[PDB]
Specification:
Chains A, B, C, D: Its main location: virion. 4 copies of one chain form a homotetramer. By secondary structure, chain A is mainly β. Chain A has one domain: 6 Propeller (Neuraminidase), CATH 2.120.10. In chain A, strand 15 and strand 16 form a beta hairpin. The first copy, chain A, is globular and about 50 Å long. Chains A and B meet through strand 2 of A and strand 4, strand 6 and strand 10 of B. The complex binds a molecule of 7 linked components (NAG-NAG-BMA-MAN-MAN-MAN-MAN) (4 copies), a molecule of 2 linked components (NAG-NAG) (4 copies), the ligand CCC(CC)O[C@@H]1C=C(C(=O)O)C[C@H](N)[C@H]1NC(C)=O (2 copies) and calcium ion (5 copies). The site of a molecule of 7 linked components (NAG-NAG-BMA-MAN-MAN-MAN-MAN) has 17 residues of chain D, from strand 20 and strand 21.
Chain lengths: ~400, ~400, ~400, ~400
């Protein structure tokens, strides 16, 4: 109809309720489920769907061997109905590639897939299910993007890309698209020293992205974008409650403009909702691996370097595998506020579970509630032994 | 379009004709059918569909082992086309959880799923396929609801919940929702001593619910709701024709305001159509187990404590497994009356058939006919031996 | 939109072109295809689909054992996209039962399924995907109907039913429905001595049905219905070119008002287009079994007792299995005439191929061409050996 | 809406970006994927889909044995969602046959399937999913057509057919259809000596077809059609950059009006975009077999007999199997020009990989970019060893 405008502010997050779960690995043990990773969720005005990067093979299929690898010519961004698994029969391919993002602007959807060899990748921007624009690698070192939904405001949908090293400075760019065409692009500015896999959400005409500093920081870099001025700023979450993984133990004071040191060249895509006292941080329970997942209310985390938790909710027990996590919201819901949501990628198989030769995952996702709801843990649920 | 209003009375039930049957267990022996239980049927203005709680695994899949269990994080309310089986590929997830209800108000559908650990469950009310309201457990003991469709009148859709003991008094509440929001809730009143899994239907602006007294009664408790005044009353079916299971043998006189004694802490979800002489009761044939199923016309059963059958129809032979049963009607059909319908859950596997490690079911459903039709029996149809 | 009216006459049939073929048995050897029999084809204003009676099990599934049997509680009328196979995932159940008919009246579709034990069957007439009317058995001996599409004119859709013996006189009735309701019914009149499984088509406000005299006739009985007057007549095809199976060898003169003798208590559903010189008869090649299939142009077959073929087309070689055949046409196609079409049921398995324990079939269907097209043979295509 | 008119010229092709890839053979190793060959891509105004000729069996099914054969009664033209594989469950049959073409005219789609024995084939032209016209073989020797999309202009959709020898002169005809009816047909004229499997595209009211001279030429014959005058001309691509396979090594000067000699009675369906300096040729890398695939920019290839490459892009490595290739474009995309696209059939199995008894393929497809994008190679991806 008309382009959506981020006119509402976030609803108050007093707890998280269960939104969607596909039990893909459980079900896929005996049905045609595609091997995936890098999932996310994204809504259209009339439907919300699960998204991920397929590996171009079923889990039980012999080609599942080797799916720990990230970039092959057999991957593709696919979307499928909320809480169903990604099956060969219900999965819709949005584009071909090994890194992606996607978002609906109110009128139609924009999907971006990057493919190529490490030194010659290219992104192709699809709009209304057609290819419209192409961007060639600018640093010749794995051009890559968000791995979760982008956000639009009045037709403008900003997307964060990174090209170059994952263990040193790189060339991050913020592209502002409208109807799949490039209106403008900036180089990253601000104090964030390295940016990868940004998780974004929007409210009151501002887009917030919580990304990952793969190079040095265990605290998360944050990019705030003005989609009207088409400008942005960058910093780190000030809070001592560190949210990357692996990471050191939490200090009593964090860092606002430098990566918090202790762990180099590693990390995981993650997210956060930064909204004054209505601030909630997601993070793995383990400081060593992608294990467990919890939400922590840390009032003023972004700007208060001594902020510590005031409430919390466990999402996945530390005795269960987690992985990537990101943000999304249904901008077309009823009501006066946007209900914060997020998903957690539950990785199964390699490298942690090497008795099988594949790597895949299932999805669990929650949204906020103004009630103070009881909590449950949500694991993948599959028994690896069955796959042997 | 406009909210549906219960303006018609029931059609005269002279017999029951076959409406839908999915043969899920037969077919699932060699195809991707999800393991389920707690099924029901429910109509939208343009389609009627089968509903149930999936166990997040196929019947032939190795994760089918253990599905006798009721509440896990892998369950979800799913709906699929009438008379098809619940397959991994045609099943639509309405919400995540282990207890549910769902009903269309004429404009759109409301679905409610409860999930959680026993002491910290919560219900989330979805409307127009989006989460709108959340209700936290109030007694911290398995918050649970109908397991069959709710009914709406002018936008108001009442739902009966129970939280607390299953073998002593509990806290039952009747919530009145409109567009997924709570308009009001009452505590249970009347003479019903325990309420669980209500089967409801509506006619001439009144909603009737035949539930289950798990605690003491072998006769069924009944809740009649006025969706305009948003008030209700409760009693038991007066009739000596007892309809719970297990149950004692039928007496010659029943009880109108107390549970009929003889069996404690057990029972099964069931239903009835209470309409003066046009009154029909469903019940298992066996007084000891979920075996067989029959419909009995017991004129004035609700209010006549000596009422006995005047006609009847066998639905499932006593030599076949049955289970839950509930009511639904197509409120959007042509004609001057609402045609009473019902479904019977045909449970296969555990605990009665323990040579297999799973528990599932198929569905058979009938609707009334003003003709006096010949009768047939409708069993699940699967040979367990094939699954060994 | 508006009710369809049979305003056109048949197109000239100079040959038959391939219309649809599903290769169901071939494909089903390694995919979730339902076991069926009694197929047919039928069009809606915007789509033409394949129809059949499922056996409630896949071909490879263990429950396929025993599907030679005709009437069980696991059967159902299903429809699926043209030329696709009937799979567990793409099949839509129209109604439950073991004998059926179905036709679109221009506004919506009417489907009829009969179910029951032999002495207590009942038909339920669905209209606009809802049950509207029910008819109880009147002779208590396998109430049964067409097994191919019915035809409508201005909302009136006549259907031929038979109840009673299959090897002696029976009670055949012609019901005239409008919006699933009964307007009127007649007993069979005319010279046809026994009627079963009528194949019908309509043109210029007249409905022609070529049926089967299971009792005594090897020539086919024909019922011509006036859907406005709601009256009909009956006779046999006069032609010496006999079209039932089994049957005696062709004589030089046939019979117009009595069954042509030689074979008792047996036969197969078949059809014909009776249109003066534009008359074409379908029949198995073998006079002993359901083997092969050919179309023969026999000018004035209905009324000329010495009529013999003037042209012909082989559809299935005598070295391949055939079975039932029936008529249908797309009444919503462009053009000035109705293009005659038909399907042939290609039966595989029992009783002819008993190395397997199942019985199923695939479908091949043709429509007429005003061209004189080259001919090909169209067998099922499956190798039974693969199923052993 | 209204008939589409080829009003735009081609966009400048500076490189090729990835458009679609289905990884059908990889995925089909463990899921219900149909065995195919002769694929292509074609767009409707609101969707672009993959197309191919099914073999009426899954790859893993036992009937896959023997699918190296071209013409059987079990083949059918099927279409399925872009980048999904052709599965038994998501494939839509357009028509029955072993040679086909299909194109949308802006209002609806025309599909043509030819079936028959070698000496008695016939084409049936479907429009708006209904059979409209039939054409009988005129030379009684494998009537055959494009195997890729046709193109329409103001309702007129020309199609090139060939009937007769594949190793000597044959009878090629250009039919001009409108709404599935024949407006006119011409015999082939011009200097092309043999025509088979034309790949066509349209721009600025002219339709260009790059075909195959199976008889003598290693350079490709080209047919340019005026869909308004309904006339055409024919010649060969003048360029020394030879594009058929097998073929001799490239000379320094090609032939404009005679086949370039060196290889007889063999070849492969291929294509090209002939647009002055914006001219790009596709071809296998190997001069001996269907191995590898590359795009070469050969300015003025059609008319310059000494034209050689000025830029190029590898699509498939010479160490991977290729096969057929053809053209298509989305005539309903936004923008001021038509973006050239093409697909490559990646053949797996027989005859090159004979350890398996089947022959199938997957599809990879690209479209042009005005950017100068990095290149990647796109192989089928399946390991034959897994199928043993
Ligand atoms: C039914 O449902 C309800 C609803 O969920 C249940 O009630 C909830 O219960 C939760 C668990 O108790 C509770 O969550 C906790 O909230 C704490 C904050 O509240 C308390 O402090 C505030 C502030 O003073 C008070 O106002 C309030 O009254 C409370 O006293 C959080 O602090 C908790 O998180 C911390 O603990 C967990 C382990 O429990 C850690 O996993 C987590 O990371 C936090 O602790 C680490 O991080 C801090 C900050 O740096 C460190 O100081 C601390 O030492 C930990 O650091 C180590 O561990 C981390 C992680 O591994 C590592 O990185 C680091 O290096 C160190 O190794 C927790 O979130 C809910 O808020 C509460 N909800 C509600 C509405 O009440 C109820 O129990 C259920 N009922 C039943 C019967 O079960
Ligand atoms: C073709 O189709 C038609 C259509 O269906 C067939 O005709 C139908 O046939 C049915 C079976 O006969 C018949 O159903 C019965 O109806 C009885 C009522 O009608 C009779 O009584 C009235 C009232 O006086 C008369 O007007 C009428 O003319 C009849 O005489 C019911 O009473 C029957 O139900 C009871 O019996 C069945 C077993 O048959 C039990 O399963 C059932 O629960 C009922 O009996 C128990 O309950 C009562 C009440 O408490 C007890 O008194 C009794 O002792 C039983 O109690 C024990 O069993 C229960 C259950 O296990 C247990 O809980 C308890 O503790 C005790 O252990 C039955 O419903 C249809 O009405 C009739 N329909 C029509 C239209 O005619 C026709 O036969 C078919 N044709 C062929 C050729 O097959
Ligand atoms: C390419 O394609 C074209 C297009 O299809 C091919 O040409 C077609 O070829 C067909 C086969 O030749 C041909 O079909 C036959 O047509 C005959 C009628 O035409 C002839 O007679 C007329 C009338 O005088 C002439 O005008 C005309 O010029 C011809 O001379 C039919 O009579 C044929 O049917 C009979 O034979 C077949 C076997 O071929 C039987 O299966 C069939 O049942 C018919 O015969 C039985 O029935 C009759 C009637 O009672 C009996 O008299 C006879 O003895 C048979 O009876 C026995 O068998 C039956 C069946 O088993 C049994 O019940 C009975 O008891 C007895 O045992 C046949 O239909 C097409 O018309 C022709 N089409 C066109 C447009 O030309 C062309 O060949 C192909 N090209 C190549 C290179 O292959
Ligand atoms: C990242 O991405 C970019 C973008 O793709 C990469 O850059 C691209 O690199 C490509 C490979 O180098 C390059 O493709 C080549 O382009 C050549 C034309 O450009 C050159 O010549 C022009 C004209 O003078 C100059 O202007 C220009 O500056 C260049 O110097 C083509 O000529 C190439 O094709 C020929 O070679 C390939 C093998 O490389 C053959 O497969 C192909 O068939 C061509 O050669 C055969 O055919 C010719 C013509 O008849 C014969 O003369 C020749 O001998 C060959 O003949 C034999 O082989 C054929 C085929 O088997 C057989 O039939 C015959 O009988 C003989 O046996 C090639 O297409 C891109 O244009 C370039 N793109 C861009 C934008 O720059 C970049 O490298 C990537 N980065 C990294 C780090 O990898
Ligand atoms: C989002 O904001 C823009 C205004 O910036 C709205 O756009 C106006 O929409 C109306 C109706 O389409 C037009 O007449 C105006 O010209 C539009 N645009 C501009 C850019 O001036 C848009 O409608 C808003 N979206 C919604 C859903 O309200
Ligand atoms: C059900 O009853 C309500 C009246 O209570 C009907 O609601 C009225 O509908 C018309 C048309 O939408 C409005 O103008 C009235 O204001 C509506 N509501 C009320 C609450 O006054 C409703 O249309 C009835 N539903 C149907 C299907 O007839
Ligand atoms: C089929 O015939 C009937 C006439 O018998 C047509 O019915 C008339 O349709 C118009 C428009 O709907 C009405 O105003 C008339 O009253 C209708 N009916 C009768 C029974 O008089 C019908 O439209 C015809 N169908 C088509 C497709 O032309
Ligand atoms: C393609 O060209 C034809 C003109 O040749 C356009 O056809 C005209 O369309 C308008 C609106 O439908 C009619 O009033 C004219 O009579 C049409 N046709 C002719 C043949 O004169 C057609 O609309 C064009 N297509 C598009 C998409 O613009
Ligand atoms: C390119 C380096 C980057 C950071 C190490 O790699 C990612 C890490 C991943 C991970 O840590 O799990 C998975 C992503 N699929 C991958 N991105 C790409 C494009 O391969
Ligand atoms: C009829 C001869 C023609 C050229 C040799 O054959 C084609 C070659 C093919 C090929 O070279 O792979 C495949 C096509 N499926 C086939 N066409 C038909 C109708 O069978
Ligand atoms: Ca399987
Ligand atoms: Ca880090
Ligand atoms: Ca009880
Ligand atoms: Ca007979
Ligand atoms: Ca050649």
């Amino acid at each position: 109809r008309d382009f959506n405008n981020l006119t509402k502010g976030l609803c108050t997050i007093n707890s998280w309720h269960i939104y969607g779960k596909d039990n893909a690995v459980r079900i896929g043990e005996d049905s045609d489920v595609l091997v995936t990773r890098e999932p996310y969720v994204s809504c259209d005005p009339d439907e919300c769907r699960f998204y991920a990067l397929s590996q171009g093979t079923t889990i039980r299929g012999k080609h599942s061997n080797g799916t720990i690898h990230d970039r092959s010519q057999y991957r593709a961004l696919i979307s499928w109905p909320l809480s169903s698994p990604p099956t060969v029969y219900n999965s819709r391919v949005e584009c071909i590639g090994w890194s992606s993002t996607s978002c609906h602007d109110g009128k139609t959807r924009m999907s971006i897939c990057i493919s190529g060899p490490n030194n010659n990748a290219s992104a192709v921007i699809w709009y209304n299910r057609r290819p419209v624009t192409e961007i060639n690698t600018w640093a010749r070192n794995i051009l890559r993007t968000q791995e979760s939904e982008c956000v639009c405001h009045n037709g403008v949908c900003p997307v964060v890309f990174t090209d170059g090293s994952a263990t040193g400075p790189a060339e991050t760019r913020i592209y502002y698209f409208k109807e799949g065409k490039i209106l403008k692009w900036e180089p990253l500015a601000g104090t964030a020293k390295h940016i990868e896999e940004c998780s974004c959400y929007g409210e009151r005409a501002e887009i917030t992205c919580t990304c990952k500093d793969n190079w040095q920081g265990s605290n998360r870099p944050v990019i705030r974008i003005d989609p009207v001025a088409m400008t942005h700023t960058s910093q780190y979450i000030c809070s001592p409650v560190l949210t990357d993984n692996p990471r050191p133990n939490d200090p009593t004071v964090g860092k606002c403009n430098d990566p918090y040191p202790g762990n180099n060249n590693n990390g995981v895509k993650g997210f956060s909702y930064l909204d004054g006292v209505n601030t909630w941080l997601g993070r793995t329970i383990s400081i060593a691996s992608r294990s467990g997942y919890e939400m922590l209310k840390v009032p003023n985390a972004l700007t208060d370097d001594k902020s510590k938790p005031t409430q919390g909710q466990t999402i996945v027990l530390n005795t269960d595998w987690s992985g990537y996590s990101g943000s999304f919201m249904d901008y077309w819901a009823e009501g006066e506020c946007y209900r914060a949501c997020f998903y957690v990628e539950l990785i199964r198989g390699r490298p942690k579970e090497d008795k099988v030769w594949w790597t895949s995952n299932s999805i669990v996702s929650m949204c906020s509630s103004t009630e103070f709801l009881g909590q449950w843990d949500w694991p993948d649920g599959a028994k690896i032994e069955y796959f042997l």
